[PDB]
RNA sequence: CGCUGAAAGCAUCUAAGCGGGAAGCCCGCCCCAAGAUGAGGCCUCCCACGGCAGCCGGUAAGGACCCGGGAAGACCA
RNA sequence: CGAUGUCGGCUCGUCGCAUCCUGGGGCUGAAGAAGGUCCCAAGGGUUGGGCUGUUCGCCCAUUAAAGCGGCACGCGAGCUG
């Protein structure tokens, strides 16, 4: 999980979703999953 | 396009009866019970039933398509029934029925003894494979889940609890 | 929950398998239940015990109609042990059996007012290297104009001791039905002749 | 001390 | 002439059915009935308002995120002593606080204020024991 | 981290709903505690005293004073 | 400025959390063990000594760890000097 301010796509398999009031960035690899904080 | 207004085919004889907020489904296997949105309205006909959104605001399409699914998983619990399959993999691993019970062998100090659930029935095939039954679709898929929690796929390793179908990605190890 | 009340009256130690366990002896029974109060009739449940026979020509009315209702002879001390309801209408040291765990509540002893390196154990000043007039004293108190107080709960010097206490989790080691003595390994608060109360613990 | 010379107050008895 | 001041009244018991009404709009109309400025000689430093019962108060009805959000608190004096309790749990344990507190908060302060505030008698549950009073139930 | 699941035929832990999950939070343990003036509860005892929500008196159940003391204690308690 | 005693130490705490340890996590260029990095978490814990007035720092021997800051560079009607 990467926590940062600018959380964007990083492939073209990366998905942005909103959880419960917050910005996900959720994937199939791993190394892409982003939380906005 | 939509899902909300495909219309739900309903087997003989499950009979479905609407209610405020809640239609019953009653079948050969068992009865479940559908909470529903007052928003939405459930419609009965010719051995299909139908639900209908007042307005094409996004409360009211983001319920009517969940409320068709809902129900139309209720009509194939009560008549086919759910499943899932496990697939235990690793040298040691294995797993056996004790009375009701699932006792798993999967590399700890202890087996691990899982308990079904009420409606959810436990059955062992080969050693190497469990499936959980039951007329709840979600329910079969919230035992199913703990089941496999018990120990997960190795990420390096073809060890673990694995979904049917599940596709087997490892990475590297020196 | 099973309760006793009694009296301690000292200390020794005995041997048992090589070993010496350090004992504190207690006078526990027999306790006449006096009163019982109910769900229905207090709100909760609870056994009020009798301990230790009174003169009569000391106890007054009030209290000797209190008696009189339950059919007791006068009796010094009267407490209650809560969720206990014995089958009989006598409670005896009989009710614990060597083996089983029990707390014990007693009165501390008393060492009045005390300082604050004997009630909290601070570490006084020094001796010497310059030390004036503070070897036993607390030192700082506070900070300075935030918050220009004292926090309450500050440890200071004050009465000390004659409190109630609960040791807990004390191996009875022992009983000897025939005296109402009840041996416990280790020790217990307050005197020898003090008033303790024994119940089954709390711990598992 | 304040007392002695170099400071001048809070610190030491009287002398004035 | 000077302006009329009312001898000492007999007061008014009412009866208000709190099930399903917003808390913070019911203990406004309380406040009110406990004030007595419903009535046309008030008088606004003697104790002349109604005594008000209040039944059901475990079903208040509030709105957005308060039954998670609404944090109640308490100071004990010591250090680290902020206690925080949320609404949901408040309704849980000691439900008639959640109203008492709207409607404590809404009556004046002082001696008086304090002396209204015990007019107020809070039950949850649909009864309460003021038969003997007959209050005159009231509509809100 | 999930289950079920639309909006958005797929996908999504979520928008309806349901799980799991910290030495932390609430209880549980130990101690204080009804001046909690919102002054609570239970058991028992005395009782309709004599004189023009009040007054003065003689008592009841009880209590205090005094005394002998106390692993209680500065005095008080 | 008709006085708001000035470093440090000692004593006594208490708070913050940008967390040193302990508890829970995601990612790892995570085989295991052990690390790295980020997230949640302030309940409790956070040693003894040599040098120097020292704060700090270096060093010795340990440790789960030897955290960083605020409280008038916390605290001299509490001590030291
Ligand atoms: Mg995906
Ligand atoms: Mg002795
Ligand atoms: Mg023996
Ligand atoms: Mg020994
Ligand atoms: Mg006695
Ligand atoms: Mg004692
Ligand atoms: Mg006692
Ligand atoms: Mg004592
Ligand atoms: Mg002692
Ligand atoms: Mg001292
Ligand atoms: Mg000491
Ligand atoms: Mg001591
Ligand atoms: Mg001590
Ligand atoms: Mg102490
Ligand atoms: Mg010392
Ligand atoms: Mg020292
Ligand atoms: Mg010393
Ligand atoms: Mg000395
Ligand atoms: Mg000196
Ligand atoms: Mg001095
Ligand atoms: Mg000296
Ligand atoms: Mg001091
Ligand atoms: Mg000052
Ligand atoms: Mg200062
Ligand atoms: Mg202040
Ligand atoms: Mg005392
Ligand atoms: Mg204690
Ligand atoms: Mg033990
Ligand atoms: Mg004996
Ligand atoms: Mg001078
Ligand atoms: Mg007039
Ligand atoms: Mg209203
Ligand atoms: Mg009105
Ligand atoms: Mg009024
Ligand atoms: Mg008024
Ligand atoms: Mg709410
Ligand atoms: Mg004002
Ligand atoms: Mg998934
Ligand atoms: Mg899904
Ligand atoms: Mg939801
Ligand atoms: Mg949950
Ligand atoms: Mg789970
Ligand atoms: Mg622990
Ligand atoms: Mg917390
Ligand atoms: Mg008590
Ligand atoms: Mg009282
Ligand atoms: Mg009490
Ligand atoms: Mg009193
Ligand atoms: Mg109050
Ligand atoms: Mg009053
Ligand atoms: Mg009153
Ligand atoms: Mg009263
Ligand atoms: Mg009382
Ligand atoms: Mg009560
Ligand atoms: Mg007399
Ligand atoms: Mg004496
Ligand atoms: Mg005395
Ligand atoms: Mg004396
Ligand atoms: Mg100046
Ligand atoms: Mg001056
Ligand atoms: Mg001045
Ligand atoms: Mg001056
Ligand atoms: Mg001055
Ligand atoms: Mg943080
Ligand atoms: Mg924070
Ligand atoms: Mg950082
Ligand atoms: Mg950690
Ligand atoms: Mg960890
Ligand atoms: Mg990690
Ligand atoms: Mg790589
Ligand atoms: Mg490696
Ligand atoms: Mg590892
Ligand atoms: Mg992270
Ligand atoms: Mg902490
Ligand atoms: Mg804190
Ligand atoms: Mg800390
Ligand atoms: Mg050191
Ligand atoms: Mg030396
Ligand atoms: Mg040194
Ligand atoms: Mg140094
Ligand atoms: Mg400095
Ligand atoms: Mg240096
Ligand atoms: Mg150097
Ligand atoms: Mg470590
Ligand atoms: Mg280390
Ligand atoms: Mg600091
Ligand atoms: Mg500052
Ligand atoms: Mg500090
Ligand atoms: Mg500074
Ligand atoms: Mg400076
Ligand atoms: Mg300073
Ligand atoms: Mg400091
Ligand atoms: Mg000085
Ligand atoms: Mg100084
Ligand atoms: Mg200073
Ligand atoms: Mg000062
Ligand atoms: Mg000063
Ligand atoms: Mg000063
Ligand atoms: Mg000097
Ligand atoms: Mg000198
Ligand atoms: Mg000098
Ligand atoms: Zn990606």
């Known amino acids: 999980m990467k926590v940062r301010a600018s959380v964007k796509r990083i492939c073209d398999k990366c998905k942005v979703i909103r959880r419960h009031g917050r910005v996900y960035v959720i994937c199939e690899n791993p190394k892409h999953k982003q939380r906005q904080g | ?20 907020g809640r239609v019953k489904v009653k079948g050969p296997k068992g009865e479940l019970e559908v909470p529903v949105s ?44 759910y499943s899932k399959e496990l697939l235990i993999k690793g040298i040691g691993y294995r797993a056996r029925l004790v009375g009701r019970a699932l006792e798993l062998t999967v590399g700890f100090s202890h087996p691990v003894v899982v308990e079904p659930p009420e409606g959810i029935t436990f059955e062992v095939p080969e050693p190497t494979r469990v499936r959980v039954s039951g007329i709840d679709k979600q329910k079969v898929g919230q035992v199913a889940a703990n089941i496999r929690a018990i120990r997960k796929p190795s990420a390096y390793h073809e060890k673990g609890i694995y979904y049917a179908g599940e596709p087997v990605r490892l990475k590297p190890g020196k | 929950m099973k309760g006793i009340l009694g009296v301690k009256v000292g200390m020794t130690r005995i041997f048992r398998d090589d070993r010496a366990v350090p004992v504190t002896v207690i006078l ?18 609870a056994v009020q015990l009798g301990f230790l026979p ?3 020509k000391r106890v007054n009315r009030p209290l000797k109609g209190h008696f009189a209702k339950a059919g007791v002879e006068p009796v010094r001390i009267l407490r209650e042990i809560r969720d206990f309801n014995p089958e009989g209408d006598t409670v005896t ?49 506070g900070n300075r104009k935030t918050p220009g107080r004292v926090y309450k709960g500050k440890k200071m010097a004050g009465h000390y001791g004659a409190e109630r206490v609960t040791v807990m989790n004390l191996e009875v080691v022992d009983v000897i039905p025939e005296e109402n003595l009840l041996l416990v390994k280790g020790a217990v608060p307050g005197p020898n002749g003090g008033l303790v109360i024994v119940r089954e613990t709390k711990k598992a | 001390s304040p007392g002695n010379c170099a400071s001048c107050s809070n610190s030491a008895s009287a002398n004035c | 002439m000077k302006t009329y001041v009312p001898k000492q009244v ?25 004030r007595g400025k419903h009535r046309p000689d008030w008088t606004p430093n003697v104790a002349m308002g109604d005594f008000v019962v209040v039944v059901n108060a475990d079903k208040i009805r509030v709105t ?77």
């Not at chain 3, 526990?28 to 449940?45: F, I, L, N, S, W």
């Not at chain 3, 060597?98 to 005390?114: I, L, M, N, Y």
Request: contains cysteine.
């Open chain 2, 38 to 81: 007052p928003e939405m309205r459930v419609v009965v006909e010719e051995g299909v039933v139908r639900v209908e959104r007042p307005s094409d605001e996004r409360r009211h399409k983001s319920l009517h398509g969940l409320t068709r699914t809902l129900i139309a998983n209720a009509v194939k619990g009560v008549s086919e029934g």
């Open chain 3, 54 to 56: 009174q003169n009569p």
């Open chain 2, 1 to 20: 396009s939509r899902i909300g207004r495909l219309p739900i085919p309903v087997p003989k004889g499950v009979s479905v009866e609407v209610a405020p």
């Open chain 5, 10 to 34: 007999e007061p008014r018991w009412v009866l208000i059915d709190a099930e399903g009404k917003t808390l913070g709009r019911l203990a406004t109309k309380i406040a009110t009935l406990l």
């Open chain 3, 28 to 45: 526990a029974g027999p306790c006449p239940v006096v009163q019982r109060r109910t769900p229905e009739k207090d709100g909760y449940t």
């Open chain 3, 93 to 141: 040291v009989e009710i614990f059996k060597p083996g089983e765990r029990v707390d014990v509540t007693g009165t501390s002893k008393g060492r009045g007012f005390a300082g604050v390196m004997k009630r909290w154990n601070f570490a006084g000043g020094p001796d010497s290297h310059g030390a004036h007039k503070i070897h036993r004293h607390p030192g700082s108190i």
């Open chain 5, 64 to 140: 957005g995120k308060k039954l998670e959000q609404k944090i109640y608190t308490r100071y004990s004096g010591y250090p680290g002593g902020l206690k925080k309790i949320p609404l949901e749990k408040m309704l849980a344990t000691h439900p008639e606080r959640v109203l008492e507190h709207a409607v404590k908060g809404m009556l004046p302060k002082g001696p008086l204020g304090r002396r209204l505030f015990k007019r107020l008698k809070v039950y949850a549950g649909p009864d309460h024991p003021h038969q003997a009073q007959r209050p005159e139930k009231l509509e809100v």
